[PDB]
Amino acid sequence: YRCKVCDYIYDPEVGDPTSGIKPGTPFQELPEDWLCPVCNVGKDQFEPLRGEVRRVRPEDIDMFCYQCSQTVRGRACTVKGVCGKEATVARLQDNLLFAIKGISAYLYHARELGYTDEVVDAFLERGFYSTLTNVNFDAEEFVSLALEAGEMNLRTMKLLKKAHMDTYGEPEPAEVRVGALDGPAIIATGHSLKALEELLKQTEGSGVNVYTHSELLPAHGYPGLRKYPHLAGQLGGPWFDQRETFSRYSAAVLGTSNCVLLPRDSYRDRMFTCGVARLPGVEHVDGYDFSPVIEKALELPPLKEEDSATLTTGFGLSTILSLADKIKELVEEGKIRRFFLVGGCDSPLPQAKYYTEFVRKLPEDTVVLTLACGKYRFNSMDLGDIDGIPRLIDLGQCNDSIVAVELVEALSNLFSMDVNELPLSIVLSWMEQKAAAILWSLLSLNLRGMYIGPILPGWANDDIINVLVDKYELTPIGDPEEDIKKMMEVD
Amino acid sequence: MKYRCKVCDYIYDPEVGDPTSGIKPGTPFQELPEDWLCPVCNVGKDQFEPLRGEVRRVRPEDIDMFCYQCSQTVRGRACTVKGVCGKEATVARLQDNLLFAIKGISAYLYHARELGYTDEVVDAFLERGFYSTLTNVNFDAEEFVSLALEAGEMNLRTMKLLKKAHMDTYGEPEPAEVRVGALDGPAIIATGHSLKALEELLKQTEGSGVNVYTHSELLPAHGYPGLRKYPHLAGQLGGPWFDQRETFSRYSAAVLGTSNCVLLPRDSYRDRMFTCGVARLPGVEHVDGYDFSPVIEKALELPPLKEEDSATLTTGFGLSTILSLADKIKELVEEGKIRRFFLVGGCDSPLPQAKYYTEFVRKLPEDTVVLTLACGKYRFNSMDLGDIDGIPRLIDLGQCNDSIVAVELVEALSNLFSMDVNELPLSIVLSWMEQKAAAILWSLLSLNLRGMYIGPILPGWANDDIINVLVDKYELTPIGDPEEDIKKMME
Numbered sequence: 013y014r015c016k017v018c019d020y021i022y023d024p025e026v027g028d029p030t031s032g033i034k035p036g037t038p039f040q041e042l043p044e045d046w047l048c049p050v051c052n053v054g055k056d057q058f059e060p061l062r063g064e065v066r067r068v069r070p071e072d073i074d075m076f077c078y079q080c081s082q083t084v085r086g087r088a089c090t091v092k093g094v095c096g097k098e099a100t101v102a103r104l105q106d107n108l109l110f111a112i113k114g115i116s117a118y119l120y121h122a123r124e125l126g127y128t129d130e131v132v133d134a135f136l137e138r139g140f141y142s143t144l145t146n147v148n149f150d151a152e153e154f155v156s157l158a159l160e161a162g163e164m165n166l167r168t169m170k171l172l173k174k175a176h177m178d179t180y181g182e183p184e185p186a187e188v189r190v191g192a193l194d195g196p197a198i199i200a201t202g203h204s205l206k207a208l209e210e211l212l213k214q215t216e217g218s219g220v221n222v223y224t225h226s227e228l229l230p231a232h233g234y235p236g237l238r239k240y241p242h243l244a245g246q247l248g249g250p251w252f253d254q255r256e257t258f259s260r261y262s263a264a265v266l267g268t269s270n271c272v273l274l275p276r277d278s279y280r281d282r283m284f285t286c287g288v289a290r291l292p293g294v295e296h297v298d299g300y301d302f303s304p305v306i307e308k309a310l311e312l313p314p315l316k317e318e319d320s321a322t323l324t325t326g327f328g329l330s331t332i333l334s335l336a337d338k339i340k341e342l343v344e345e346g347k348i349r350r351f352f353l354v355g356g357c358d359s360p361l362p363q364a365k366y367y368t369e370f371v372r373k374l375p376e377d378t379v380v381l382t383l384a385c386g387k388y389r390f391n392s393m394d395l396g397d398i399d400g401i402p403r404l405i406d407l408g409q410c411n412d413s414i415v416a417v418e419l420v421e422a423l424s425n426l427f428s429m430d431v432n433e434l435p436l437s438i439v440l441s442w443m444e445q446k447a448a449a450i451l452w453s454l455l456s457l458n459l460r461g462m463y464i465g466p467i468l469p470g471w472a473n474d475d476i477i478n479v480l481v482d483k484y485e486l487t488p489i490g491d492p493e494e495d496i497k498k499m500m501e502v503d
Numbered sequence: 504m505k506y507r508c509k510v511c512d513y514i515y516d517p518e519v520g521d522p523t524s525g526i527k528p529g530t531p532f533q534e535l536p537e538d539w540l541c542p543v544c545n546v547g548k549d550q551f552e553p554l555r556g557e558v559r560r561v562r563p564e565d566i567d568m569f570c571y572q573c574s575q576t577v578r579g580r581a582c583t584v585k586g587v588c589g590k591e592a593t594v595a596r597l598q599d600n601l602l603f604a605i606k607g608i609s610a611y612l613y614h615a616r617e618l619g620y621t622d623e624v625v626d627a628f629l630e631r632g633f634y635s636t637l638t639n640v641n642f643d644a645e646e647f648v649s650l651a652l653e654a655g656e657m658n659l660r661t662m663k664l665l666k667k668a669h670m671d672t673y674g675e676p677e678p679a680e681v682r683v684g685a686l687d688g689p690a691i692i693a694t695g696h697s698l699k700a701l702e703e704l705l706k707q708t709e710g711s712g713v714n715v716y717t718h719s720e721l722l723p724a725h726g727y728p729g730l731r732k733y734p735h736l737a738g739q740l741g742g743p744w745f746d747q748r749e750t751f752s753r754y755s756a757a758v759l760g761t762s763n764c765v766l767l768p769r770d771s772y773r774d775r776m777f778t779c780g781v782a783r784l785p786g787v788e789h790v791d792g793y794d795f796s797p798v799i800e801k802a803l804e805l806p807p808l809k810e811e812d813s814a815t816l817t818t819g820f821g822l823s824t825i826l827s828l829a830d831k832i833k834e835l836v837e838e839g840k841i842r843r844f845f846l847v848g849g850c851d852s853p854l855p856q857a858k859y860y861t862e863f864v865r866k867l868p869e870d871t872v873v874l875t876l877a878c879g880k881y882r883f884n885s886m887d888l889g890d891i892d893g894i895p896r897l898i899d900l901g902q903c904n905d906s907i908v909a910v911e912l913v914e915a916l917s918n919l920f921s922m923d924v925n926e927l928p929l930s931i932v933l934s935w936m937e938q939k940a941a942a943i944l945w946s947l948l949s950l951n952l953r954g955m956y957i958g959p960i961l962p963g964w965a966n967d968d969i970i971n972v973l974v975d976k977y978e979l980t981p982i983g984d985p986e987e988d989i990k991k992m993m994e
């Protein structure tokens with residue numbers, strides 16, 4: 013028998029002479045209250061010879077957990093928990109943890125605006141308590157808890173969108189100049205619209221121009237944010253062009269939320285962090301006091317005007333609903349054949365080129381709704397429109413997933429069909445915990461047949477992957493052409 | 504030279520080159536393009552060191568770090584040496600540390616909320632911390648040290664709020680002599696920390712005539728005037744949490760788990776155990792929001808318990824009972840008839856290295872008093888230690904969350920003898936097992952208590968750098984040998 017927890021082999025050939033086990037005693041001729049000499053688990057946590065359990069190299073660590081003192085050798089539980097928890101349950105606990113992390117991020121951003129939800133904080137406590145050492149061992153309960161986390165994330169994104177709309181108005185379409193103007197510059201990266209508003213308020217009259225980057229692009233749609241003239245436009249693209257963007261523009265850089273990367277020496281003395289963002293050797297902004305960043309921007313050599321391009325962002329729900337009747341006409345005529353939700357968080361992985369290919373081969377009688385940084389794979393494509401309806405529609409940040417939700421609910425009422433009968437396909441890009449919370453949000457809405465890229469989450473063992481694919485029909489991204497062919501044929 | 508990826512250990516060999524990217528066989532590493540990245544995890548030339556120290560030894564459980572929360576993760580399985588995102592092992596371990604501290608805080612928050620007691624600033628800090636440990640938000644280790652200390656302070660605040668909840672709902676605890684041993688009649692044994700579930704159970708059992716016994720962590724309930732007022736609160740039964748498997752087997756009782764430390768059941772008592780609150784076990788009935796009718800029904804269906812020659816324990820020393828003896832303690836210390844106080848307690852484990860505690864207390868000189876708490880008390884609370892001059896040599900402050908009164912106690916002592924906190928005749932010996940204990944430890948560290956002892960082991964997430972921080976900046980001393988430790992602590 014080899015120990016499930018620490019892979020200690022009890023071999024009936026040796027026995028244990030020091031304890032009374034003369035050499036030759038079978039495993040089942042051991043005392044009843046005998047425990048493991050390494051991990052202190054009973055006779056049950058001994059399995060008849062499995063085979064080279066750990067010995068992991070290219071992958072296959074069965075599980076990981078070192079949160080309690082019982083952990084094997086004081087380093088990590090990696091096959092089975094000393095507490096008795098198996099690998100699948102540990103991975104489900106980590107899944108719930110990531111979802112609640114995404115919820116907590118959106119919660120922090122809402123509270124930045126004075127918007128609070130008590131039941132969500134209670135659920136945070138409840139979930140983190142559920143992932144303690146010896147509290148919960150039920151996997152199905154963790155499925156239930158993941159779905160409840162999806163529901164709470166719906167609620168949290170709803171609260172954050174209400175915070176944004178009350179503080180800045182409902183976003184409406186805006187053509188954003190991507191390209192520099194003449195003058196000192198501050199580039200802002202992240203999600204915090206409150207930090208951007210404070211900076212814009214502090215820079216009115218200073219004459220330094222403020223540009224958005226990555227997930228701060230949707231700010232150009234908010235009436236309370238676009239009203240500032242020194243909000244010049246976009247500059248750079250998604251988060252991972254950061255190191256080149258911040259290098260090439262001679263500007264002060266401020267990172268407001270996550271997706272900030274370790275800086276390169278070219279712009280290290282001209283970068284700042286604020287909110288929760290924090291980098292070693294980078295100056296951090298005390299609350300919202302952006303005096304150092306403005307100082308830097310005015311000390312730096314100004315930017316140079318450049319032939320600019322444009323991006324179109326900020327489709328609030330109301331702008332889309334003012335087009336519902338034409339969309340109805342167009343689908344019933346047949347001049348629009350399907351809606352595709354293609355977006356979410358991105359990564360510099362090669363498999364994410366899939367997205368640029370996917371939209372590039374999409375038929376021209378289709379429309380795309382995009383989201384988060386994964387929009388920067390195809391938002392510059394000149395796709396045009398269908399009888400006045402744009403083929404690309406930018407709802408905003410990842411937290412604007414919620415309006416996407418609202419949209420389908422309208423569409424189900426528009427065409428008088430159940431949600432899982434619409435001419436709608438869903439293609440997710442995920443990268444972080446916020447995306448995990450969004451994914452479980454979509455799963456709590458029973459959205460079947462969704463596609464996911466660039467990879468399946470690293471915390472999902474075979475058990476979890478199969479539960480998703482057989483109970484929720486979550487389809488991994490494969491080949492763009494074949495995927496489109498599968499999604500569009502009711503024939 | 505050959506070159507090793509720090510992130511995924513892909514070896515670039517100048518004899519082969521890299522056929523997949525364009526590097527013909529024979530190219531030296533420094534004659535590679537600037538934009539050449541690892542063909543496995545796509546991290547640049549920057550994170551490549553010359554294959555120095557090709558030595559590799561035991562890899563199981565000797566994983567430098569672990570993290571698989573994002574899609575960038577190595578091989579889509581786990582980052583185990585350095586993050587593709589750029590996060591180092593020390594920072595990952597500090598993030599996990601903060602996560603465990605906030606997990607303990609969340610547990611105490613849930614228990615406080617059970618009583619209608621909530622604190623907004625603590626939930627704000629929870630959100631803030633989880634956001635600090637998202638993917639690309641914080642890479643500054645010093646800031647995570649600061650956040651661990653802030654988590655200690657927030658945990659102090661949470662424990663204070665929880666103690667106020669307990670005292671408002673049940674009164675201030677006072678010493679109680681509780682019978683450990685069964686009575687005649689049907690029985691329900693309750694395990695965990697939730698006093699509200701116990702109160703609801705006792706109210707629902709008034710008149711039913713079934714006797715309720717406390718186990719592991721519900722023992723301090725016998726000190727609360729609002730809980731000891733119920734006659735059917737018979738006494739203690741069993742000991743700490745880890746005797747569960749035998750205790751629940753030997754007594755023909757219905758089992759109810761109110762909080763954490765519930766273990767996978769054995770078939771003898773599975774059909775007679777119930778969970779409630781956050782505790783949940785597979786194949787065990789869960790109680791839906793109190794309403795303990797199923798548990799009472801079960802207790803009434805089982806063969807009743809039989810009386811047994813019992814022992815006794817003394818628990819529940821509230822702050823007021825202790826402070827009403829402060830002048831006697833002053834007399835005794837100033838005369839010299841008490842030479843040092845020892846705080847010995849905290850959550851315990853079925854680890855063998857924890858036998859130290861029973862030895863440590865058993866060898867303590869008779870001119871010392873011990874203050875204990877949590878499950879680590881069950882190592883020496885049955886010892887007949889007696890008293891010194893009317894002051895008991897063992898004092899049970901209550902649950903692990905009653906650590907806070909210990910905090911208050913020491914400040915009283917510093918004001919009692921008019922001496923600085925870090926000059927009192929007081930030594931601290933911690934037992935830890937879980938995340939609640941981690942929060943308590945960071946609470947103690949935010950209070951600058953130097954020279955504390957910790958057992959049974961050093962946290963499994965503390966790499967050499969973190970351990971170095973603890974031992975050089977806060978003089979955290981691991982427990983060694985009882986006599987040697989006592990002689991050092993008594994000098």
Ligand code: SF4
Nearest residue numbers: 077079080089093095
């Ligand atoms: S909680 Fe369980 S799996 Fe995690 S370290 Fe402790 S014994 Fe191991």
Ligand code: SF4
Nearest residue numbers: 570572573582586588
């Ligand atoms: S955040 Fe970094 S360490 Fe964690 S999974 Fe992503 S790449 Fe790996």
Ligand SMILES: [Fe+3]
Nearest residue numbers: 015018048051
């Ligand atoms: Fe073992």
Ligand SMILES: [Fe+3]
Nearest residue numbers: 508511541544
């Ligand atoms: Fe690599």
